[PDB]
Design an enzyme around this catalytic site. Structure first.
Site, PDB file in Angstrom:
ATOM      1  N   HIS D  64     -21.271  18.453  20.193  1.00  0.00           N
ATOM      2  CA  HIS D  64     -21.631  19.727  20.819  1.00  0.00           C
ATOM      3  C   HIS D  64     -21.461  20.845  19.771  1.00  0.00           C
ATOM      4  O   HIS D  64     -22.491  21.258  19.204  1.00  0.00           O
ATOM      5  CB  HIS D  64     -20.846  19.957  22.129  1.00  0.00           C
ATOM      6  CG  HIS D  64     -21.294  21.116  22.898  1.00  0.00           C
ATOM      7  ND1 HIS D  64     -20.461  22.099  23.366  1.00  0.00           N
ATOM      8  CD2 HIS D  64     -22.583  21.467  23.190  1.00  0.00           C
ATOM      9  CE1 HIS D  64     -21.200  22.992  24.020  1.00  0.00           C
ATOM     10  NE2 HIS D  64     -22.518  22.651  23.899  1.00  0.00           N
ATOM     11  N   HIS D  83     -15.392  22.315  24.975  1.00  0.00           N
ATOM     12  CA  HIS D  83     -16.078  22.454  26.278  1.00  0.00           C
ATOM     13  C   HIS D  83     -16.013  21.165  27.044  1.00  0.00           C
ATOM     14  O   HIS D  83     -16.813  21.003  27.974  1.00  0.00           O
ATOM     15  CB  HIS D  83     -17.516  23.066  26.167  1.00  0.00           C
ATOM     16  CG  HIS D  83     -17.576  24.095  25.104  1.00  0.00           C
ATOM     17  ND1 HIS D  83     -17.771  23.761  23.758  1.00  0.00           N
ATOM     18  CD2 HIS D  83     -17.266  25.434  25.148  1.00  0.00           C
ATOM     19  CE1 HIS D  83     -17.599  24.882  23.050  1.00  0.00           C
ATOM     20  NE2 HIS D  83     -17.311  25.899  23.856  1.00  0.00           N
TER      21      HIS D  83
HETATM   22  S1  FES Z   1     -17.440  21.861  20.896  1.00  0.00           S
HETATM   23 FE1  FES Z   1     -17.007  19.889  21.970  1.00  0.00          FE
HETATM   24  S2  FES Z   1     -17.560  19.956  24.178  1.00  0.00           S
HETATM   25 FE2  FES Z   1     -18.257  21.918  22.987  1.00  0.00          FE
END
Ligand code: FES
Ligand SMILES: Nc1nc2c(c(=O)[nH]1)N[C@H]1C(S)=C(S)[C@@H](COP(=O)(O)OP(=O)(O)OC[C@H]3O[C@@H](n4cnc5c(=O)[nH]c(N)nc54)[C@H](O)[C@@H]3O)O[C@H]1N2
Ligand SMILES: Nc1nc2c(c(=O)[nH]1)N[C@H]1C(S)=C(S)[C@@H](COP(=O)(O)OP(=O)(O)OC[C@H]3O[C@@H](n4cnc5c(=O)[nH]c(N)nc54)[C@H](O)[C@@H]3O)O[C@H]1N2
Ligand SMILES: Nc1nc2c(c(=O)[nH]1)N[C@H]1C(S)=C(S)[C@@H](COP(=O)(O)OP(=O)(O)OC[C@H]3O[C@@H](n4cnc5c(=O)[nH]c(N)nc54)[C@H](O)[C@@H]3O)O[C@H]1N2
Ligand code: F3S
Ligand code: F3S
Ligand code: F3S
Ligand code: FES
Ligand SMILES: [Mo+4]
Ligand code: NA
Lengths: 235, 823, 117, 135, 118, 135
Positions: D64, D83
């Protein structure tokens, strides 16, 4: 696009007959880990072709359609290259447009084969759903069994390939035939291209001449060739 | 009990043991259990997990009665032991050689093959062997050394001591001895077990920047070609040859080569032997690979330098060299091309190898493959060249070839020693600035005291007859002086002996497992302990360090050699403290050791650490990452040295191959070519050759280990080889009217010795091959005094005549003279 | 008779049993020498394979097969002779003729080079 | 060039037998800015290596927005604190729940029976925060 | 796989609101000819990010799912890259798993949108 | 029974006069999983049986790792293809060269002059891959 990953010198090489038409053209399937490639020097790739400079006409049949990347049951990715065998007597390295696409029509999760059937599918009255193989067999065998017990074999119908190549062949025609004829023992069976259990060649066989009575070399030795009801450049 | 074996119970204790003997370092398990228990035949009811309810299929186990024993511990309790190869060890994959296979039988028991193990100090009290106490032994031995230090300095105190690994070596023991000799006593008058000065087998290759154990055993699996130079590896390094070389020759490793190198051709693997003699290894390679994939370069003895200079010249002239490698990573190439230049015709005349065979060896080994890459050619050498015609020059010549062809630092390559013993060296620096030929010094009447430690140069010195003569005579003087004493205190006796050594005498001590032939001269013998009686660490020919776990007690008061060294150090310290000499006492500090592990911590684990003294260690400066507990967790797989990292979750991570980035062990990081002149045989050897008929080649038998210190007590070994044998050509035999089981004298200007005749069709006319080092017919009597510039002997370089003594009918009745070359 | 773990098993059960002792009635393009064919032997043959029927096999020769049928004049009939047949001309079938009578175009049909089936 | 492939290094991780079941080993691949974990799962999985076909390895950077994820031994997952994306170590980095659009990248290990060595030889998937796996 | 084609510094950039949920996160669509690419130096690509060394956490949201190659009515092929806007107040550069796939779910003849009604 | 000996069967091999010089006869002893050879050597040897004291018999399983050895008539030896051990049939199974730590086990034959019978009655040495000669 504008490039190809060459097969490494030591890439795995298997034999493959074309999936499609009668001619049965010979091909080689090169298989190798996705993160390896061949070099351009002829002795550093599996083709033995010199990609350091332009190749002459007839040196190769090789397009991106003849390549793919498959994802195996172990999750590992492999380049494949499906190309005609130059030393096969049938085709002498020729590939038709149909066989030339074999690599593209191999199963991959994102490619032309993406909608391949991967599990039993059941229309549960009003919607398609997956089901298990055991449930599928219980329903299908269950029905066949019920029909045998109450109606006899004449309640069980098939239309089935009798042919060779992909979706046919000696293992497959035996398997289906043994099932339909020796086990279930149903006569309510047609063939893929014709609506009864018959032959295309009743007359010639009964006259004593099976319909595949020569060699392709005979087409080389003839004075005259007749092509009757036949579009052989295309077919 | 000839026809059954007691199985280990499922719950039997299992410890790890590295083979006692050769370099390969095969992994074994030692099962130990009370005498009156046994395992069941069901696979889950025995420790082996094998089904003895029906015949086992081939390869399922290695298990004979010789691999079993019953030991009697210090508490009087009796325990079954079973010493068997580890199937999951990467070195041997469950193989056992005949030598390692006998380990159980050669463990100490009061009634078995180890029955004559030294169990207490032994003293020759003028005119008879008697036991004595450890304290009396130390008072006499320390007393002498102290008197010698006070009056003559360290130059009066002599040693010949192991420097090797495995049994009678290893990191604990080489540290202990070296600390004693060099840091404490500070004597330079020290030779090594196999050579008569404080030197290396590998001066040239090291000075060129290539340590001699620079690859993995896996490399022999990845090679296109393997050279075996002066080397009989089926007999001398069995399981490396069986587990690694043969699978390559059979095609079982091809797929792994191709997986590593996608765009490189891998032909069938081939093997080249440089050896004057057609050995079992040549025959077995032919059997396995076919005659077309073996090249036996049957050179004339001593002509290796000519061979390599001819091959180097040819590969340079063909351009079968790595010019980018040479340019980036080497120095001196252009000079070597000039100094080493020799035509194939001149090469052929000197070696006796035909030009076609010389060219073929170069074409197999150095000519680019079709895919463009040089062959992966592993160059393996041992004593045929290490004890060859000018050790330093042969290595110079060979390494030049290897470096020019980039056969170091690539997988499937390496220019390596095959090795002898295991390795296990951690020592202070040698405290002198001069090479000293120890044997010659002793024969000239130098030294007050000589200690043989873990070696027996009566059997193994070059020019061994001159040695024994002198040592026996010098020992006699001491014996005669001791005889006049009656009721003398230890201190008075030390004066009596010391006086005798001023009139040509020498006090002789042996620190050993057994009396040995050294007992013919020794005044004092101290009992040592071997692996399993102690913990011991060592590494094999690919630098794989393993811990051999203690599982039983030593005989009597036998001690680990490192702890014998501490005993000696502490006795000297105490004498100096008593004599009011604080400075001299301080030199004997640092031996507060209760177990062998303390020697491991003090030596191997201190190398290159802050506040450590200068330590030369095969573990390097990351030695401290190895602990006994960490080795235990590693198993018989250990770690290849040097260690690179450690943590709890990963274990020990080490080093597969040396020099893979092209950084060599020299000042500039480059490999250095050296000149290699051809000067013929040494004059002293040539003089023997001119006077006498036969080349007296010598070396190993598969079944016999070394000086046969165990094997001499083994009824099977003694029935098979009751005497040292000499392989002779059958036509030579007929001319001398000898056949199998006749005894001959072998003799020259240097000595006379004796051997049983072993007719061997593969021996060339005017050539012979005698078992070395043996208990009945010592080969070394006929070796010359000649050594190279660093005092490395040409043990394989001597000639002599052969005279029939007569027919030994008993040998003819009981010994096989059938062929040892399988076909 | 469906104890099959791999496709090869179906090959052994069908093609390779045709005309063998203790086999049930099997109609095979391999004929009664189909047992000489094995997967390993086909592998060794390459993409050239063998023309059926196989006439001989050994390790040194490989599969040796049949180029052309009927070269000695022996046909697949009771008497070994080829049989002529009457061929009456009856025009088009009335079902097809009715279509032709009612409608304008002959609706020929078949293959395109590029499209498979 | 010719070349369509990235030039991955061959990096020793450890020997397989040193790995304990469910005890992650840290290493960097294909350079020191790319943190990775190898773990013996204790039970075979598709594409696992080693004697029990159960050793798997990953980039630990969340696909992510790149936070280093942490291996949870109790679930055998990698969890992202950013997140809350979670990846399955036993399903080749399949995203259980989260905001990523790419599975956790797998470090491809060669296992050599002869040496017991595990070598990192490639990456399947793109490491966070990189134009190409090899910089 | 194991690499991405960067948007050139001069790549076309349009505004796109996420196709899906209420939040209406802001995105940028970078479009450029297929045979062009950005450099790894931050001033030589449209993202302004430094791909000469590993990027730190939060520096970008970018995966292959956020990229595609479209074929336009003129037959010409163009790289697209559909990524969240760091300066949009709604999302501050966040992309959900749903919006993050928008590039993949644009129409291309061979991709996820291949069965689009035409 | 506090018995110290194994219960060997008595197995007829053949009559001695059927054996031709240097032509090995195969049989199983002491059960069908234990292949053995008897050979008339043609010249008397220590402990040979029969009219010319020259018949000897052996287990043919290599005492190294158990491969069936082959009798070579030219050398009168048994040669193992596994790791190249070779035993002397004329020196009671003495290992000439090899990796075994036990001589080839001898099958003990009674020779009855009355009947000319050769009967296998015991084994001297331990047959490969067995806890005891008699399973
Ligand atoms: S940086 Fe890993 S869930 Fe967003
Ligand atoms: N002619 C000729 N001579 C040769 C050679 C040759 O090829 N030709 N080869 C040379 C070579 S390469 C070698 S290595 C040498 C070997 O020569 P030596 O080193 O003299 O011979 P080894 O048999 O290895 O000696 C080991 C001795 O230590 C004892 N020992 C065993 N275990 C222990 C232990 O734990 N502690 C102690 N303290 N003693 C122990 C043994 O009983 C034995 O006496 O001979 C050399 N001599
Ligand atoms: N079975 C067994 N194995 C052992 C040992 C043992 O005692 N028994 N000892 C161990 C030890 S310590 C060592 S050092 C090694 C030794 O292992 P190797 O050195 O492999 O064994 P050696 O028999 O000494 O000699 C090897 C070959 O040198 C050849 N040779 C002789 N002269 C020349 C020459 O001028 N040039 C060349 N090129 N070759 C020549 C001989 O014919 C011989 O076959 O073995 C170790 N392994
Ligand atoms: N490219 C391609 N090749 C294929 C196939 C494919 O789908 N694609 N299918 C394969 C299969 S299964 C088959 S059966 C073959 C088909 O191979 P062909 O039979 O060669 O192909 P068709 O196109 O069905 O028909 C051949 C010709 O019959 C002609 N024709 C129509 N009516 C009559 C008539 O009354 N009399 C005569 N004499 N000719 C007439 C048509 O004009 C046509 O050119 O092709 C095979 N090869
Ligand atoms: S490639 Fe295939 S489609 Fe027919 S012409 Fe050859 S068999
Ligand atoms: S069993 Fe021993 S003698 Fe060597 S070949 Fe193995 S280390
Ligand atoms: S689905 Fe909703 S959370 Fe955002 S990226 Fe798309 S507007
Ligand atoms: S199994 Fe017979 S020599 Fe090893
Ligand atoms: Mo040695
Ligand atoms: Na006395």
């Amino acid at each position: 696009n504008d490039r190809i990953t060459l097969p490494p010198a030591n890439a795995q090489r298997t034999n493959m007959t074309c999936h499609f038409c009668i001619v049965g053209c010979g091909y080689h399937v090169y298989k190798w880990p996705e993160l390896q490639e061949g070099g351009r020097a002829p002795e550093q790739n599996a083709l033995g072709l010199d990609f350091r400079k332009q190749l002459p006409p007839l040196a190769v049949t090789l397009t991106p359609a003849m390549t793919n990347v498959v994802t195996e049951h172990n999750g590992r990715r492999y380049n494949i290259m499906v190309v005609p065998d130059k030393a096969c007597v049938v085709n002498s390295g020729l590939s038709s447009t149909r066989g030339g696409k074999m690599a593209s029509y191999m199963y991959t999760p994102t490619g032309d084969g993406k909608q391949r059937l991967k599990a039993p599918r059941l229309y549960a009255a009003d919607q398609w759903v997956d089901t298990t193989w055991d449930h599928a067999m219980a329903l299908y065998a269950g029905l066949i069994k019920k029909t045998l017990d109450k109606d006899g074999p004449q309640g069980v119908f098939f239309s089935c390939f009798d042919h060779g190549g992909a979706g046919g062949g000696f293992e497959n025609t035996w398997g289906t035939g043994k099932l339909m004829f020796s086990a279930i023992q149903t006569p309510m069976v047609r063939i893929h291209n014709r609506p009864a259990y018959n032959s295309e060649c009743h007359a010639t066989r009964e006259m004593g001449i099976g319909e595949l009575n020569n060699a392709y070399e005979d087409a080389q030795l003839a004075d005259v060739i007749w092509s009757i009801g036949n579009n052989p450049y295309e077919s | 009990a000839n026809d059954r074996i007691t199985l280990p119970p499922a719950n039997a204790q299992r410890t790890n043991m590295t083979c006692h003997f050769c370099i390969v370092g095969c992994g074994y398990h030692v099962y130990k259990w009370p005498e009156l228990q046994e395992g069941g035949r069901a696979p889950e009811q025995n420790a082996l997990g094998l089904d003895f309810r029906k015949q086992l299929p081939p390869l399922a186990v290695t298990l004979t009665p010789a691999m079993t024993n019953v030991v009697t511990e210090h508490n009087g309790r009796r325990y079954n032991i079973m010493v068997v190869p580890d199937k999951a060890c990467v070195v041997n994959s469950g193989l056992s050689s005949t030598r390692g296979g006998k380990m159980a039988s050669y463990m100490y028991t009061p009634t078995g093959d180890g029955k004559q193990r030294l169990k207490a100090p032994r003293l020759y009290a003028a005119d008879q062997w008697v036991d004595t106490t450890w304290d009396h032994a130390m008072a006499l031995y320390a007393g002498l050394i102290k008197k010698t230090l006070d009056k003559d300095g360290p130059q009066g105190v002599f040693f010949s001591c192991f420097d090797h690994g495995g049994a009678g070596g290893g990191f604990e023991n080489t540290w202990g001895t070296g600390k004693l000799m060099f840091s404490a006593i500070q004597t330079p008058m020290v030779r090594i077990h196999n050579r008569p000065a404080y030197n290396s087998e590998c001066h040239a290759t090291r000075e060129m920047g290539i340590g001699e154990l620079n690859n993995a055993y896996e490399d022999a699996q990845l090679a296109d070609v393997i050279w075996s130079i002066g080397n009989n590896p089926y007999e001398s390094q069995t399981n490396y040859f069986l587990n690694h070389w043969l699978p390559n020759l059979q095609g079982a490793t091809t797929s792994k080569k191709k997986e590593r190198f996608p765009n490189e051709n891998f032909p069938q693997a081939r093997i080249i032997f440089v050896d004057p003699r057609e050995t079992p290894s040549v025959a077995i390679a032919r059997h396995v690979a076919g005659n077309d994939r073996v090249l036996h370069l049957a050179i004339e003895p001593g002509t290796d330098t000519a061979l390599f200079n001819g091959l180097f010249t040819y590969v340079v002239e063909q351009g079968w060299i790595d010019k980018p490698f040479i340019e980036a990573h080497t120095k001196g190439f252009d000079d070597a091309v000039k100094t080493n230049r020799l035509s194939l015709d001149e090469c052929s005349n000197i070696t006796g190898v035909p030009v076609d065979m010389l060219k073929r060896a170069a074409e197999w080994s150095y000519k680019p493959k079709a895919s463009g890459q040089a062959p992966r050619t592993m160059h393996a050498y041992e004593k045929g060249i290490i004890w060859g015609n000018d050790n330093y020059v042969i290595q110079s010549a060979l390494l030049d070839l290897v470096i020019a062809t980039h056969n170091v630092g690539r997988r499937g390559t390496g220019c390596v020693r095959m090795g002898g013993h295991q390795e296990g060296y951690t020592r202070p620096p040698y405290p002198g600035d001069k090479k000293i030929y120890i044997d010659q010094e002793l024969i000239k009447g130098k030294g007050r005291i000589m200690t043989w430690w873990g070696c027996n140069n009566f059997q193994t010195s070059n020019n061994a007859q001159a040695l024994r003569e002198a040592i026996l005579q010098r020992s006699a003087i001491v014996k005669q002086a001791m005889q006049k004493a009656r009721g003398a205190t230890t201190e008075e006796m030390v004066d009596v002996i010391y006086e005798a050594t001023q009139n040509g005498g020498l006090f002789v001590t042996s620190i050993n497992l057994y009396p040995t032939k050294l007992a013919e001269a020794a005044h004092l013998m101290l009992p040592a302990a071997h692996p399993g009686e102690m913990n011991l660490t060592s590494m094999n020919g690919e630098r794989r360090i393993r811990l051999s776990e203690k599982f039983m007690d030593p005989p009597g008061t036998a001690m680990a050699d490192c702890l014998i060294a501490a005993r000696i150090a502490n006795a000297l310290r105490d004498m100096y403290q008593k004599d009011g000499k604080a400075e001299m006492a301080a030199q004997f500090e640092g031996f507060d050791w209760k177990t062998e592990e303390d020697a491991f911590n003090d030596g191997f684990r201190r190398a290159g650490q802050p506040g450590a003294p200068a330590i030369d260690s095969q573990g390097g400066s990351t030695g401290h990452l190895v602990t006994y507990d960490r080795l235990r967790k590693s198993g018989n797989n250990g770690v290849q040295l040097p260690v690179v990292s450690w943590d709890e979750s990963k274990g020990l991570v080490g080093t597969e191959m040396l020099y893979t980035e092209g950084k060599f062990d020299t000042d500039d990081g480059k490999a250095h070519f050296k000149p290699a002149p051809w000067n013929g045989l040494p004059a002293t050897v040539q003089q023997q050759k001119d006077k006498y008929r036969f080349w007296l080649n010598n070396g190993r038998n598969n079944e016999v280990w070394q000086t046969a210190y165990h094997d001499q007590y083994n009824s099977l070994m003694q029935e098979r080889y009751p005497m040292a044998y000499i392989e002779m050509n059958p036509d030579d035999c007929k001319q001398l009217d000898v056949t199998g089981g006749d005894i001959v004298e072998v003799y020259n200007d240097f000595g006379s010795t004796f051997a049983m005749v072993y007719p061997v069709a593969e021996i060339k006319r005017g050539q012979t091959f005698m078992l070395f080092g043996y208990v009945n017919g010592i080969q070394g009597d006929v070796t010359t005094d000649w050594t190279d510039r660093n005092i490395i002997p040409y043990y394989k370089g001597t000639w002599g005549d052969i005279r029939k003594v007569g027919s030994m009918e008993e040998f003819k009745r009981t010994v096989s003279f059938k062929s040892r070359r399988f076909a | 008779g469906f104890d099959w773990k791999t496709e090869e098993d179906a090959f052994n059960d069908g093609f390779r049993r045709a005309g063998q002792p203790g086999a049930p009635a099997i109609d095979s393009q391999g004929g009664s020498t189909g047992h000489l064919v094995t997967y390993d032997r086909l592998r060794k043959s390459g993409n050239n394979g063998v023309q059926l029927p196989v006439v001989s096999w050994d390790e040194s020769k490989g599969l040796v097969g049949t180029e052309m049928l009927y070269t000695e004049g022996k046909f697949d009939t009771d008497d070994g002779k080829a049989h002529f047949k009457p061929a009456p001309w009856n025009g088009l079938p009335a079902t097809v003729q009715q279509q032709k009578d009612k409608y304008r175009f002959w609706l020929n049909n078949g293959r395109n080079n590029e499209v498979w089936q | 060039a010719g070349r369509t492939t990235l030039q991955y290094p061959a990096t020793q991780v450890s020997v397989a037998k040193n790995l304990k079941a469910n005890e992650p080993v840290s290493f960097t691949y294909p350079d020191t800015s790319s943190p990775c974990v190898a773990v013996k799962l204790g039970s075979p999985v598709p594409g696992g290596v080693g004697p029990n076909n159960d050793i798997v390895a990953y980039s630990v950077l969340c696909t992510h927005m790149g936070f280093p994820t942490s291996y949870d031994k109790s679930s055998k997952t990698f969890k992202c604190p950013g997140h809350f994306t979670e990846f399955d170590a036993e399903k080749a980095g399949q995203m259980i729940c989260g905001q990523a659009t790419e599975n956790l990248p797998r470090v491809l290990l060669r296992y050599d029976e002869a040496s017991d060595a595990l070598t990192a030889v490639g990456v399947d998937g793109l490491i966070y925060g990189r134009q190409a796996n090899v910089i």
